[PDB]
Amino acid sequence: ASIAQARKLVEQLKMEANIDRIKVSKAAADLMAYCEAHAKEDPLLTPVPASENPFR
Template sequence: QVSKAAADLMAYCDAHIREDPLIIPVPASENPFREKKFFCAIL
């Protein structure tokens, strides 16, 4: 039964690979966790 579970897990991973942000990074414009760039100007 372990081999069937492993096969099911591999099939699930293969089916959802396009939605995995670790495989295909999220574009910077859509990433809510991107670093914000703050500019500080001293005159």
């Protein structure tokens, strides 16, 4: 009973622990690049004029 559960747990842990990880700085850099690239297409942090606002 518990033996099978422990076997499944250790197998899942082994599978998860064998995943390549990039540096956190690289991930932060790509997130920042994505946020900067689409800055002009987000009409919530940069408000849109009432002419083009469908909820005016």
